[PDB]
Write a protein that binds this DNA or RNA. Sequence first.
RNA 1: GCUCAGGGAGGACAGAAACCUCCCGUGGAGCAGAAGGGCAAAAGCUCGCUUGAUCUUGAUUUUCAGUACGAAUACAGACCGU
RNA 2: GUCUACGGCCAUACCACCCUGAACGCGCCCGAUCUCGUCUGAUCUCGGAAGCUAAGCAGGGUCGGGCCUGGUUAGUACUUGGAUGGGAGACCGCCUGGGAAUACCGGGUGCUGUAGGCU
Lengths: 170, 56, 293, 205, 159
Amino acid sequence: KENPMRELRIRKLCLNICVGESGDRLTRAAKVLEQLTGQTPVFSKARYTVRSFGIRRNEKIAVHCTVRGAKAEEILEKGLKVREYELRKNNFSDTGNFGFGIQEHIDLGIKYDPSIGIYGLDFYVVLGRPGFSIADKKRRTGCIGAKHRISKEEAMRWFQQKYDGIILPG
Amino acid sequence: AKSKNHTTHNQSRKWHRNGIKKPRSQRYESLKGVDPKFLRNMRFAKKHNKKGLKKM
Amino acid sequence: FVKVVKNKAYFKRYQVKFRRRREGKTDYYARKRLVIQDKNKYNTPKYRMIVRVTNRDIICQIAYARIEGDMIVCAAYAHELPKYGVKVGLTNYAAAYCTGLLLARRLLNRFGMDKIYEGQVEVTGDEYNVESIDGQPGAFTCYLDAGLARTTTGNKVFGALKGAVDGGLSIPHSTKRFPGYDSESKEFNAEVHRKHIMGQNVADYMRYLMEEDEDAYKKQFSQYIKNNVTPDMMEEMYKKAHAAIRENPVYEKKPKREVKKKRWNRPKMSLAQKKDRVAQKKASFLRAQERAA
Amino acid sequence: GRRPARCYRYCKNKPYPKSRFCRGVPDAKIRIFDLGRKKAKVDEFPLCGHMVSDEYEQLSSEALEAARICANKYMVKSCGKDGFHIRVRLHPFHVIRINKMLQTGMRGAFGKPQGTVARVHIGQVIMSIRTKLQNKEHVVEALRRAKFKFPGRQKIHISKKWGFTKFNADEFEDMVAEKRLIPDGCGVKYIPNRGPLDKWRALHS
Amino acid sequence: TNTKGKRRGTRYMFSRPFRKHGVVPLATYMRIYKKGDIVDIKGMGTVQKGMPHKCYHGKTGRVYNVTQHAVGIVVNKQVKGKILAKRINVRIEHIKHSKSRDSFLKRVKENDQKKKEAKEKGTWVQLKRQPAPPREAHFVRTNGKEPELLEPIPYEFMA
RNA sequence: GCUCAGGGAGGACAGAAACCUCCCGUGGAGCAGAAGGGCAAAAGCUCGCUUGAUCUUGAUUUUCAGUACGAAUACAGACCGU
RNA sequence: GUCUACGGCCAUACCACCCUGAACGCGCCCGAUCUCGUCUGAUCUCGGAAGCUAAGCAGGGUCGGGCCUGGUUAGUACUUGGAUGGGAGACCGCCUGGGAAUACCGGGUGCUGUAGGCU
């Protein structure tokens, strides 16, 4: 018998498409997240100039969108239907989180507007518990305590139980 | 020709000959450098002392 | 392997912040400005009104700062309003208004300025603030201690400010952060404030659920139906409570009960007990070792 | 070549070390400080000799290398390859300056660094040789020879400490047998009654 | 010649102590400075507005003027020959109440209570301070024991 | 309104290095410049609104002859900003 | 015995992990119609009261780390004053007063102001 205030919810599903280029090329990159989620994404400026790849300072190279609540599990479901409910064990982070990156964007159930082309994206799942929110208040904040934190072998045995997912090594 | 740059050799001896006299301290120091809002009000209080002379 | 950032040297060099700031309560950057006094005032107490909205309560105090610790003259809690009429909805804008009103009425009764400085009796939400009269004692001037709460338009602390303002407290303010202020239009609608003060934004949501889904209404307004406090009871329940607060704000205290003096905590362990524990631990280790091999 | 030590013998100046203020310093003649069979246990070399200073003087980096090689190759000739361990216990951290002529005069004569010199105090140990109790009349000769490559007065003292440790020779093996001391390569780790108790149970495993 | 300038040789003087950095305690601002009370000056680095010159750091003067944020001190500064009592405007973070006057005013009040009480009776209370007088005669009891003999230790070459 | 330098770990192409996410992080960053001091719900970073970098008497500090300049600190009378 | 709001001194209060928390509180918690703000009601603002001490918080624990505070180190290092003292010097010894700092060994682990509850 477990405490119902020790449940494990998805806090957010963080999607990002880093195209590494700027302009109208990136303007079309926003539409595939906006169609997939149903909410507008937000751009990210390149941090500093490195020329080897072909970026420069404060030029927009990436688009990202974070989904909370009911729709976070809906977008994650079609991410693991692509992956056939198999993640490598090294996908599971030490701080409780996990993530993956699917190859081709249409596989999620978006039709191919001609020339909107081929984008790949990064799924990242931030796992939570009731009372993980007290680390980001303006009132008396605090560390969430050691018993309450999510480990890696907690995060994978959640994945093993929820989606009936097969956690292959490597 | 070069010369000695600076010293303070005979100066301690020189100061003490006529003695080190402290500032001439008194009762009733001047009101120069006091807050001039406070000072103008203090001057009105002095001006209006004879109005309450009969009770005194 | 990687370098340990919480070194024994880290702990040596480490300086803790002020306790209130560690716990996460007081902004000392704010307090320095709110609290201290112009040095050509000398022991003129600088009064501030403290409004803190918890999960189930609204705490309104008046304080003046000392070297020992700021001395609270008057306090008005949100769970005192059940005496005056308001049973449910104690962390909303009408609750905040009655609390801020009650704190003004309680103070003015204690200092004998209850009959002089009646205040705004008919509640409207307009730009009111109190004028001092010739011959009578001057009006009580105090400054709002907002705290850490992000002070955006229609924050509950401003409801408490408005109640005290109409109560007779001479708080300095503007009507940019009262509800009914249109951000784009940049003018002030006193009627939308009055709807909020009399708590009809509550009553309109109650109607919205009662005509959309009466089971969603059962979940949301669960304790309103325990008392049967209804959308047309709503305005009468607050405009009655304003008159009841103004008629009698004097606080009768909760009287002290005899103590059993029973302890609930574990007391601090002694040196003798701590040393005997280690003696027993080291003894039982070598007890287990000789029986094992 | 270079000047005599007579010029740079006495501790005249404030310690002017190799810093970001003094750069352009040549490398010291003493680089290897401790040699012999350095990878030796505490137990196998119980005896410890010291050569102790007597003057408040500056000792050359070059004199420390000369004294090290002299003591080394006497102790190599005496007890052999793996029967001692020398430490030179003064690191030359004092830059000495030289106002170089070659036609100037004395218009701003602040020197360029000549080299490094090891500044000493009275009773401060210069060198130390730890070996067996067998090689008691070899250590004294080795350090007695080493004296000659130094200026001033140098005394010798066969110490009460068990080799290069901080504990007396007649407490050491009793303190090891009651597990207050831990053999730690060339030194010993003193572990008191202060940590967690898993420390204590893992010690008495 | 030295470089002139206001903060030249104030490196450790106007520094904050070890683990005493950051936020300034508020009692500092809440202490009440009257016109006359004797006040010792100590510059602070944390607050850069309204410092005393390094000439005054550690000197004690008296208050002749109190404005909103600062007080006027009259400090005796020495030049070559003569001493100048001179009038500085220093912020109240760089200022403390001297406890030199809190030992005198306790004396006066106790000294006067000892003349309120014992003026009518004829019992005469000595008020003035004596320096520690030469010690009184007494009997150093050897309670059974004969004193232990101390003889100097022979020399042993330590390190 | 946030929190920095650096680090650990994860995530399509993506690597030592583009971008996202969590954890540790007393200042190991930044504050135009030399160096010292100082600073973490800030003095740093990002936003919003602006012109107190405006008009006007005296006092005072620093160099000091206890003079000027330079620079500064506390006030007072206005008009303003937030 | 103990919390809440506002605090004073600002580690005897901080950090690591474990255990226990009666009653009111404080909370997590539940939602997004009005207020208000975001890529996203996560934060912020708002309207709630079905659940829960799991976390925050409180009390306690640890031959804990740190911090505080004694002892030791040691009348040691240094130092005011003195000598037609020693010494080729480098530096020493004495007389006359003052006197530290590590390693190392113990002991302690928040005090309290105003105002208002719970027992």
